[PDB]
Structures are given as C-alpha cells and as structure tokens.
Design a protein around this ligand. Structure first.
Ligand SMILES: CC(C)c1cccc(C(C)C)c1O
Ligand SMILES: [Cl-]
Ligand SMILES: [Cl-]
Ligand SMILES: [Cl-]
Ligand SMILES: [Cl-]
Ligand SMILES: [Cl-]
Lengths: 311, 311, 311, 311, 311
C-alpha cells in the first residue's frame, strides 16, 4: 500500500476501459442517465513480479486490500459510484489486471435546440490524481471499451460508445490529474411525434382558420377563442414535464408562432366585424378572402424559414 | 477462498433457482419492477468433502467467509441487489447448498403496441464470470424455481415464472460468461378500461355527431369545438403519466383517429353553413344527411381495420 | 452459533410479538404502509442455562453475535427491515428474551370496491425457515402484541392490532416454514368526502338538468356541454392520483353513470330541438316535461340500486 | 459495555438537550419535517473515574465502542436517525458528556382547520428503555436546548423550541420507559394568500353576479357556467397538491359555499328566464333586482358566520 | 488520537478550501442544490514533524485512522456529506495536507421577489467545534477555493465561487465554534421567458380588449370570460410546480394585476350593455371608446410602476 516505483523517471500509465452492460433512466429534465458497466484497470507494479516456475502459477489473484490500486474516480457522477471488484490478476512481469462492476448516475448536459430531431453525446469522465512519489497518467485499452448489443434507451437509437484515447492532463490544487473522455452517441428515435403531437395541434389551428369562411362574429369569436383554449389544453396534455429551457428550441419557436397566429386570427375576426358594422362590407369581404390564403401561406413559409434556421 | 479444482478439464456447474416471494412496484413508464425472492445456488467443492462417521454430522453448515462461493450477479438490476444469506450447507460429497434472500429493482422493457390488451415477459438475467483457474457455467435446478401463490401485481394476471434452462455462454474481455434467463409472464386486466376510459371518450365523440341534426352554425360550432375541449380534458383526466412512447400503439392510433374525426366534423359544419349562406340548401342538407351515417360507419370500419392490424 | 438441541423430538417454539410504535405513509396507490415497531422474540436455549446462586445474577445480558438467534424475516416487506437490537436477556432456565426496534415499508393489498366507505385489513407476515438440525415453529405471546395509543393514520380510524395465533406451517424447497399473520384493522374517515367531492359534482350535474326548462337550443347546448367540461375539470381537481383500479368500484360506477347522464341529456336536447324544427312542438314539449322528473327519478333509483349492490 | 452500578437504589438520570441547527422540508401533506440538530447526553458512570495527576489530562476522550452509552431513541422518526458522534468526554468524577449531530424526518400531525391562519406544535419525542440491572430516567438540561437564530421554515414564523422538562415515565412490555417531549412552535405566513388565492377566486365569483344586470338567457348561461369552469381551473392552478383532509377546514367551507353560490346563481338565471317565457316579467325583474343585493349580502354574512365559527 | 499541543496559548488554525467539481439539481422549490467538490484541510501537528534527511522522504503519507484530523462539518446539509479521503500528506515541519472528495445536498434559501430577473447567493457553511484541550479556528486558503470551468446549472449564469475569509467565531453550549461562509453567486437566464411565458399571456389579455370594438354583449361575454379561462389554463401550462411563495413577487403582482384587468373588463362590458338596454347609447359608446385607450395606457403605466417598485 504505496505506489509502484519508477524504473527511470516515467509516470505510471493506467490502461482503462469501460464496457456498458446496461444504460437506463435517461432523464431529459435532470440531464442525467444511469449506467451499469465494467471498469477495467491495468498497470505495472514490479513489487508483485514473480517467476512462474518457482511459483507454479502462471497468474496470481489478489484481494483489493492486499495490493496498491490507483484511486480512479468519475468526474460527472451524482453520488460516488457503487463498485464491486470482480477480479484482480497479476501476470509474472507484474502487470495488474483489475476489473470491477459499477453503476453510476452520470450528469451530462443536453442540447434540445433541434428536438425532437436531436442527437446527443453523453459523457463519462474518468480521472486520477497524481501522488507524492510519482505521477499517474490514464490511457485507453481499445479492446476493453464497448457495449452489450442489448444496450438500449427507449426512444433513442444508440449509435456508438467510444473513448477519446488522448487524456486531458492538467494541474489541480498543485497536483497532476489525468482525465479521460468516454462518449455515448445517441440520436432521437421519435417517429410517433408527428401523429401524437404535431398533427393534432395543427388540426386545432386549422379549426380556427374556418372563421375565414364565416361572417357570424359570434361563431367566429367562439371558433378562434375556443380553439385557443383547445390548443393550450392539448399542450397541457402533451407537456414535456421539463422545466422551461433557458434557450429557444425549434419546437419552442413553432409553438410561439402558433400563439401569434391565434392572436392575428382574432385581429382579422375583430376587423372583419368592425368593417361590417361600419357598413364597409367590401373591405370586410376582401380581408377575409385574403386571410383564406394569407394564413396557410405565411404559416407554411414561416415554418420553412424556422426549419432552415434550426437545421 | 480459491475456486474448487476440476476432476479432469470440466467446467464448474453452478445450479441456480429463483423463488419469487413478492413482486411489486411495476413501473410501466420506467420499465422497472421490484422483487423479493430467494436465490438458491449449488455446486461441488471436493476440498469440502467429509465422512459422516468421522464428523458425526450428516450435514455441515458454513459462514459465507469460510468457503468459496461463486460471484453470481444480475445483469439488469438498477442498484446492486440487497442480499442476505439464509443458509449454507455442505453434504458429505462436498456439494454446497447456498440460499439467500434478495430484493432488486429489475429493468425489463415493455411493449405497449397492444395496450390495454397487452401481455409482457419480464426478465431476470443471472450471470457468472469465469475465473483464472477454471470456467464457471450456470444451470437451472427446476425444483428451486417458482413463486408464492400470493404473488401479485395489481392490474395484471401473473401467468408463469419459468427459466430458459440452456445458458447463453459467450466470451467477454478474454473470459467466459454464463448467462441465465428467468421470465415472468404477465397479461393485463383490461376490463375497467371500457367503463372508465373507452365509453366516456366515445360519448363525448357522439355528442359532436349531434351537429348532423342541426342547421344552427352557432350551436354546431359550440357542439364540435366544445366536445373537442371535453375530449382533451378527459384525456388529461385519464393520462397514463408516462413519457410519450417512441412507437405507434393501438390506443395511440384510435386517439389520433378521434382527433381526425373532430377535424372532419368541423369541415362538415363549415361546408353545411357555407352552402346554406351561398343559397344551396339542397347540397347543405344532403351532406349533413350523409354524415349522419357516414361518420358512425367510417368510424366503426376504421376501428375494425386498426383492431385487425394490431391484433 | 448452532441451533439449540431438542430434549426429545420437539420443534423449537419462538414466541413472537409486534408492538406498533408508529404507523405512517399509507400509500393507497402503492398499496404499502410504513411502520416503527418492537419485535420481541423468545425461545429456550439450554446451552445458555445457569444456576442463579453460583452466578449471583438473576439474568445474563448477551450481544447478538455471542448467541444463536433465529433468522426471523418479514414476508411482505419492500426492502429488508431496518432493525436495531434493543435487548437480549437470558433467564436461569435458558429462556432468551430478544427485543429489537424495526421500521418497515409493508406491502398489503387494498380493496377500493366500497371506497370511500371502506375498511381495510393491513398484514404483517412473520416467517422462520427451519434449519438442518431442527425445525422452528412461531407462536404468539399475546402480552407482547399491541400498539401505542398515539398510533394514527391521517384519514383512518385505527380499530385493532391483533395476531392470528395459529401459524401457517408449510414446506418450501424441502424445508419447513412457520408463518404468522399480524393484522391492522383500519376503517376510513369519509365525512369531508360529501362537501368536497359528492355535492359539487351533483350541483354540476343539476346545472345541466336546467336545460329541461328551456327551449333555446343554443342555451341548452351550452348548458349540457359546458357542464360536461365543468364535471371533467372538477374530476381533474379531486383526482385520486392513483393508477386506474383493474376492478369496478362503487364511486367508479357512479361516475360512469354520470357520464351516461350527460350523454342522455344531450340526446333529449337534440330530440327536443329536432321535433321543434320538424314542427311537432307537442312531442318536443311533452319529452322536455317528462325529463324534468325522468332524470332526477332515474338518477335517484339507479343510485339506490348501486348503493344496495356494493353495500 | 454494561450499565453503571447504583450507589444506592437510585435510577440513572440521563440529561438530554436538543439544539436545532437546521429545520427544513416541512411536508404539510405527509405531516413530516426534517431536522439537523445536536443531541447532548450526560450521565455519571463511575467505572470511568480517573485521577488527573496520574493521567496528566484533566478530561478523557473516548470512542463510542469503548464505553457504555445509553440507548436513546426517537419515538416519531421515519427511518432511524443518521447520527454522527461529535464528542465523548469524561471528567474525573465519571461524568460523561456525549454530543452527536443527527438528522431526522420527524412525523408530527398537523391541524389544518384554521388554514392559512394556522399555528402548529411540532413534536420530537426522546425515549430510553430501562435495563435489567437498573432503571433509566431522562432529564432536560435547559442550557443544552435551543435553536440557531438562522433556523427557518419557508412560509412559517418559528416562535419557539422548548422541552417539557417532566418526563413521561411509563411501563411497556414489563420494563420502564422514560419519554421526553421537545416542541417546535410555528405559525403561518398568510399575506400573499389574499392577492394570490382569495382575490382572483372572488373576482371570478363576482363576474358570475353580473348576470343579475342582464336579461339575455344566452349571455347569462355563458356567464354563470363559464365562470364555474374558470373557478375550477383556477383551483387546479392554486391546488394544495395534498390528499383530501378527512375533516372540514375553514378554506374547505368557503370553497364549498362558493360552489353552492354558483348553483343558486344558475337557479336564479333559470327562474328569471322561465318567468319571462311564462309572460311574468314583473316577478322575473323583481327576483333579478333582489339578487343584485341578496347575493353579495348573504355571501358577506355567511363568510362572517364561518370566520366566527372557525376562529 | 488527541489534538496537537500549542507552542504558546494560540488556537489551532485549520486552513480550508472548497473546489466545486460539479453543481447540479438546483431545486427552486425545495431551496436545495447538490454539489460534488473537494474539501482541502490543512493544520500543523508538531507530533508528526520529521527530518527529511533521517527519513529520506520529503513527504510522508498517512491513513485517516493513523493521525488526528479535525471534525469539520457542514451546517446546511440535508443528510451528512458522502466523503472519500483522496490524500493525507505530512511535510517535515508537521503540516498536514488533507483532501477529500464529497457530495452534498445543500439547503440555501432563495429570494424570488425579482424573478425571473433574479440573482441568488447560494451558501455552504463550514463549521468546527473547539475541543476541551484547545480551541480550533477556521481560515481560508484562497489558493484552494475555486470551481471547474465546466461547472453549470441549467438556466443560470455561474458568476463566482468565493469564501468570506473572516470566520464567525461564537460560543455554543459552553464551547467555541468557528463558522466559514462559501458563496456561489448565480444570476438567472431570463430570455426564453419573453416568448414562452410573457408574450402568449399578453396576447390572451389583448384578445379580451377586442371587446372594446364590439357592441354584441353575447360576443363580449364570450371574449372576456373565455380569455379569462385561457389565461388560467395557460398559467396551469407554464406552472412553476413550486409551493406558493409566502411573500409578494414581481411576477406575482403582474399576474394579480392581470386578474384585476379581466375583472374591470367584465365591468366595462356589463356597463356598456346596461347603458344600451337603458337607451343611453351616448354613454355606452363613450365608455367603450375610452376603454380602447384606458386599458392599454393604465396597463403600461401600472407595469412601469411595478417594475420600478421591484427593481
Ligand atoms: C359560449 C360557449 C359556446 C363557449 C365557447 C367557448 C368556450 C367555452 C368553454 C370552454 C368555456 C364555451 O362554453
Ligand atoms: Cl466515482
Ligand atoms: Cl446484482
Ligand atoms: Cl424482513
Ligand atoms: Cl432514532
Ligand atoms: Cl456535514
């Protein structure tokens, strides 16, 4: 229980590897996701070297307490990881082969600007603090990085689980720290978004536009205002249950634009009636007639503009 | 505390068995369910063999620390299982009989495509990682698999708890892994759906269809739009409180179709009025007259089509 | 640390007793409840007997580790109970007197068929698995079963805390099990239900029935449909927040019947108008006049029928 | 690790004291509140007496394991308290000075009858069970009982933290129990109630009363019914999120009375119209004229009656 | 062990420093936030002094058990912090350099008076209780206080992480206490508030004001009342999900004022109609004409007054 000594001035290279067993509980609101994975660590400790002939065994198994193990920690975890040592094995030269199974709630931010057509890169940061006697540097064993084929996130297509092989070495509180980046690339698999959210919302908006084919101010007030209540009630029904996002999203803009369309529709209805009351049914009829094309066209173009702006 | 040695080159067969005591907290949203069960393990360690004459005892009881126990883990659990060793018993030949009581929150995906007439297969995966000295393989003792008769999940019929006797042996990180599949088959209790959800949502839709027996555009706008609000408010009332499902479900389609029916009903109402204003009460009356049969018939057929498509 | 030996062939009788200190968090939805209680165990271990004269002491206090204690477990608990040994005391003849303080989230199903006029029987099942050497049977010490007078569940009258003195001995995985049933009888506090839920729901229904005193189809459509929205919004306001119950409840039936009454009221309104439009104000007036008595009477009788059926 | 022996037949007096560091998470629904506090215990165990000359030290510090500490427990806590021993100090005479820092979710019932003008007395019950060798009695050290000035509960004024100095010694399961009552007196902060809840609810109700200045049955149906929906939606907006209270509260009564006022207003509207249709516009006008004063006056009086009844 | 001895009469100075690694789960409702940070402690224990020449080593590493470490605690944490000792290092003069990684749910009150244009100062209070042998005082090592650049709280700009260098030394239960204040200054990201909350809420209000351009009492009742329902439904849609704030906020006032504006708008509508019915269309027209400017102007000024009052 002291770090291994350097042959020359070299730092201790710890070979890492994360193998995802299970990925679950991705909370879009909290920006967290839970993982069940294997963490494999490998380093050279000469104090533990042995001759396979005079020992008989080709590999020696140790208990965590018995030998020096580097203090590897996760940077972005909520509570400290729940680890269980699976195996520790020493090869004749002194190469330790550590493997543990852990579960962790990882904090990784999410970008909803392009929701529900968004892709995310989830991060798992590995860190090691360099000791008094010698410096510790992390390295990636690509043979020890992967994920089980069964690894799923409902409503997401899991593209890849890879690691940024070059560690980000830096000084923190007068000591060296080696930081490794493991990336989980996921893209939204939301198909049912169209018939469940977009299409009913659009039907309600269209229902308001039928007031451009009526002259009954009482039926028109009922149309635009009652559809505005329906629109809001529908949005309470399909609510993301997430706090408001500080930035403007694609879907956020569309919804804003829809509120603006209900507003402008009321203006038209109000004008059409006022012109009729002021015995000017020529202007009242022309406005209503224009609105029949004006509303769908402006809506269609404004959506094309937004879609272009976000994607 | 070292694995038992092989007679010849054979792997160590560990006989498993899960006996469900309690099943609870099935979360449709989270795709999780909690379990209280017995995990019985049984293997042969010759180092432990005894003569009942020299020992006096017909069976020897050990403490977990005293003997070598295989590291059996669950694949799909959220946090590591809460285990309590009930009993460890060695028979004269060296056959170990381990039994522990555990509780675990198991992650198993759910298929809502046929909801609320759906059946689900809940999974409990047992795994063992092969050691340095020898390979470990899992096997099922069918006498040690079952469930208490009292075992219940409110709103589900618990059909069976069985295990896929042939383990899925595979290589992972240069070591053999032996995986076992325990399946909990449950089917839903869909009767209260009819009076609680289907019938009221239907009454609301029918209330809209009474606009095919009226010529009052003001009363008809009120009918279709106000029932559309009622429909949405009712759906907020019977809300599954689950995130939206990425795939299209049977119930999802019906609801979509209902929104489309409210849309088409507004088109009819609008047309009826426009033809009536444009002094064409022949076409206005004929359309309304058709709609009286057109709407119920198309609805009935479209539902028959969907029911056939999903089931 | 081995079970006590039998004088003859008799099984070991462990005398149990649960004393409720606190009862809390009764979750109607989850079908669980939390408890703080004392669990008192008493058995005869001769290996521990002593002469009070030679020992000069009445009773000898032991530490849990020092002596053999039977593995008593709860059948219906979520996580394993949080136990704290209060006292272990041996009398001269070897009668052990164990007492521990525990807290447990107990899973006990609930029957809402007669809600909110329901009574429930909460269960706490104690179990012991018989060992290799000898069989263990549970017994009830009635002097050690009770509850503190301060024991409360908000919204329930706590009737009794008693135990089914005869244990349910049965075989499980070729070993004997001794199961004891502790019952907590609670009845509901239904008074605030009348002014808070029943009466406003009834006022909303009556408001719709005023359409039987009007001939204005526009005012009548507004009446029945707007009260149908009010009814739903009120139900969202008084929502049980519980997943839907798979079975039909008393309150479930009443609400279903209310939805059917809103439906039939729309039929009347529609008919009355159609007959008036078809210049038949004799039938239109007679139907409306009947409905003024038909609706309250049928509602009153249909309730009487339901109340009789459930109680 | 055995209780201290009595000089004469006296019981062991343990001097207690709770000092609130932080109070938080007061859940009105759950009737629980969380606390961070110091629990100071002091008793004389002569077995621990030392000579300051032979020891060098004027006070000796011990580890919890090393000496006999009385088993002090909380009666009304959800899970067992999270304790951390801060200091254990013995002075030559054998006087032990224990101090711990604990956090606990305390269950104390709440009386909402006078909400939001209510005051509550939160309880923290300390208990000690007497042993075989000698009886243990709790006592209060008033110098060791208080609260930090920073101690806050959002929306409450924290009046006092005091203890009922006379313990409630009683027999339980043939052993003596000494109980101590610590009381946290809090009163509510109710000013934002008026503008946030009471006033908008009253504006909506007044909006309905404008139907006493109109003869349009269609505008009047819309007024009373649409305000009844608004009233309900507003109540969903300001919802306490608490299960229904089994007893009738002050606020509960006001809301009930408001529902009754919407009901009676519909009766007026219905009557006024029926009398007008039955060509009796003398009675129709007189009723409406009365209602203009009848409704505000009866409402004002009925509230005065209720306020008097509850306070 | 035992505290270090003083050279002269001086108190023991413990040099503290908190380095935020992760900040997450800021709950505006619960007035709590979670943190992952390093806690660095440093004091001089002469008992540990050594000669680097005689020792060979320039620094000695110890295990927590081996040496005296001061009991540093947090004042405002929910449960006791989850700590893991990273490193303990003694320099030849006996200066201990302790470093641990902890995670804690910190309770810090929030002031919503200026929401959503608010800034908050989150607190982390460090405390040490003075022992009998000697007094302990906390000090800040400014080189050891900071935050990772990646440290984020969604929807907030993290301004600074600093400590109030002068500790709050005070007496508590006849012992000295040294308190340090660590402050996390955050300001809100209010831009998405305008398009998401302020603008749609405003449109809904303007929709009501169109009743000043209509004489149809039926269309006007529908306008003001239906927009009042829309306003409430929209507020249920954008709900903070936070318990009501005991104090009056800026947004609280605006919303109250909006409810008052819906009320006054109904008064106008009612008056305009009553004057028209009482054949006084001169006053009816003049009021409506004034309201067209009166409502926007008074609203604009009243908002200017409020904005000035809060900011
Ligand atoms: C006036 C009447 C036809 C009406 C129109 C719009 C909305 C509602 C409800 C949702 C308040 C309504 O009752
Ligand atoms: Cl970690
Ligand atoms: Cl596991
Ligand atoms: Cl248990
Ligand atoms: Cl406790
Ligand atoms: Cl702490």
């Amino acid at each position: 229980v002291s770090p291994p000594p350097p042959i020359a001035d070299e730092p201790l290279t710890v070979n890492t590897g994360i193998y995802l067993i299970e990925s679950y509980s991705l909370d879009d609101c909290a920006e967290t996701f839970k993982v069940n994975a294997f963490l494999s660590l490998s380093w050279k400790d000469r104090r533990l070297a042995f001759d396979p002939v005079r020992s008989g065994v080709r590999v020696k198994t140790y208990e965590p307490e018995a030998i020096w193990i580097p203090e590897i920690r996760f940077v972005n975890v909520e509570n400290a990881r729940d680890a269980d040592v699976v195996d520790i094995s020493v090869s004749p030269d002194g190469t330790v082969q550590y493997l543990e199974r852990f579960s962790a709630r990882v904090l990784s931010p999410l970008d909803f600007r392009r929701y529900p057509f968004d892709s995310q890169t989830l991060h798992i940061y590995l860190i090691v603090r360099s000791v008094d006697t010698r410096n510790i540097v992390l390295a990636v064993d690509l043979e020890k990085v992967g994920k089980n084929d069964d690894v799923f996130l409902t409503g997401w297509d899991i593209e890849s689980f890879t690691a940024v092989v070059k560690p980000a070495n830096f000084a923190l509180e007068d000591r060296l720290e080696s930081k490794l980046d493991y990336q989980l690339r996921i893209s939204r698999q939301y198909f049912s978004y169209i018939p469940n959210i977009i299409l009913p919302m659009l039907f309600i908006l269209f229902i308001s536009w039928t007031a451009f084919w009526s002259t009954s101010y009482e039926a028109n007030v009922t149309l635009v205002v009652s559809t505005l209540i329906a629109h809001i009630a529908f949005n309470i029904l399909v609510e993301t249950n997430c706090p408001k996002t500080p930035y403007m999203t694609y879907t956020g803009a569309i919804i804003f634009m829809i509120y603006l369309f209900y507003f402008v529709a009321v203006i038209e209805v109000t004008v059409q009636h006022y012109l009729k009351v002021e015995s000017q049914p020529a202007r009242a009829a022309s406005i209503t007639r224009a609105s029949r094309i004006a509303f769908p066209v402006v809506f269609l173009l404004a959506n094309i503009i937004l879609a272009f702006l976000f994607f």
